[PDB]
Amino acid sequence: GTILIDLSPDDKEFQSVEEEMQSTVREHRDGGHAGGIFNRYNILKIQKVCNKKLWERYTHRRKEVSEENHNHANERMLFHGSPFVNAIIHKGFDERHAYIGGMFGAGIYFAENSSKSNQYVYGIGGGTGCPVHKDRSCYICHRQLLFCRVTLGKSFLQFMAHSPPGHHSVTGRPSVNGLALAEYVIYRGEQAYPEYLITYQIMRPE
Ligand SMILES: CCOc1ccc(-c2nnc([C@H]3C[C@H](NC(=O)c4ccnc5cccnc45)C3)n2-c2ccccc2F)nc1
Ligand SMILES: [Zn+2]
């Protein structure tokens, strides 16, 4: 029972999500090996995802977390990348499909940097790239990120199967022998809602 509402490029709501995606782009340690080489996207479509079932199951979990974190949800708008976006918008985030070899264990990963989420769109480390050209830096094939409402609650700072005791999420941090950029991880699908579905291409520089 999911409905996509196509947003006009002249919508302030569109422009807000567009601005956030473009501005949160960073240079990457791997020289774009995983995500491709770019400093800007081609923003084709931004659609608002609408599902009462998935929305109600989010708000319900958000309430519980607030009561366990001094009446503060710790709600953040964050980008999500994965090969499973089409499923997520229909059946919601599902921890049961989490990759156990992840750096912070079997969780659903988010980022405050759109360019980081991009790296995971065609699998872990961009996998074998786009299906058509088998190219991680493909400027041709259309990509999809989710821009999600995420309840982080009491987030454990680090650098596993569920959140540490007393906590509701993990915030990964830049270590000289570790991460360059921030990660955010939940171990429960109901703690995130995919509010916006963004269709885009990475754009060739020069
Ligand atoms: C160092 C980088 O390591 C990472 C980065 C991101 C993630 C991650 N975060 N979230 C995901 C996906 C797997 C979750 N799947 C669903 O929520 C889901 C929901 C509904 N239906 C599905 C059907 C098939 C697969 N997944 C689903 C979301 N993934 C994910 C899981 C497996 C493979 C690639 C991924 F991006 N895991 C590890
Ligand atoms: Zn391609």
Author numbering: 952 to 1110, 1115 to 1161
Q: What do the authors of the reporting publication say about this deposited model?
A:
Tankyrase 1 and tankyrase 2 (TNKS1/2) are members of the PARP family of enzymes that control protein activities, interactions, and turnover through mono- or poly-ADP-ribosylation. TNKS1/2 regulate a number of target proteins, including AXIN1 and AXIN2 (AXIN1/2) in the β-catenin destruction complex resulting in WNT/β-catenin signaling pathway inhibition, and AMOT proteins in the Hippo signaling pathway resulting in YAP signaling inhibition. Tankyrases, through their ankyrin repeat clusters, bind to AXIN1/2, making AXIN1/2 accessible for ADP-ribosylation by the C-terminal TNKS1/2 catalytic domain. Several groups of chemical substances have been identified that inhibit TNKS1/2 by binding to the substrate NAD+ binding site either by occupying a nicotinamide pocket, adenosine binding pocket or by addressing both of them. Although the catalytic domains of 17 human ARTD/PARP enzymes are homologous, unique features in the TNKS1/2 catalytic domain allow the development of tankyrase-selective chemical inhibitors. We have previously developed tankyrase inhibitors bearing a 1,2,4-triazole moiety and binding predominantly to the adenosine binding site of the tankyrase catalytic domain.
As a consequence, in the following optimization campaign, the South 2-chlorophenyl moiety was replaced with the 2-fluorophenyl group of 23 resulting in acceptable efficacy compared to other substitutions. The comparison of the binding modes of the 2-halogen-substituted compounds showed that the chlorine or fluorine atoms were pointing into the same direction in the TNKS2 active site. This is in agreement with the clear difference in the measured potencies of the atropisomers. Next, all possible hybrid combinations were synthesized employing the East moieties of compounds 20 and 21, a South 2-fluorophenyl group, and three different West moieties revisiting the 2-pyridyl-4-methylsulfonyl moiety as well.9 From these six molecules, compounds with the 1,5-naphthyridine moiety (10, 11, and 12) showed approximately 30-fold improved cellular inhibitory efficacy compared to their counterparts with the 2-pyridyl moiety (13, 14, and 15, respectively). The binding mode of compound 13 in cocrystal structures was similar, and the hydrogen bonds to the backbone amides seen in the 1 cocrystal structures were retained. The large East moieties 1,5- and 1,6-naphthyridine (e.g., see 87, 88, 106, and 107Supplementary Figure 4a) appeared to form a more efficient π–π-stacking interaction with His1048 and a hydrophobic interaction with Phe1035, causing the side chain to gradually rotate according to the form of the East moiety. However, compounds with this naphthyridine moiety were less stable in microsomes relative to the corresponding East-pyridines, and consequently, 13 was short-listed for mouse pharmacokinetics studies. A water molecule forms bridging interactions between the pyridine nitrogen and Gly1058 and Tyr1050, and the same applies to all the cocrystal structures described.
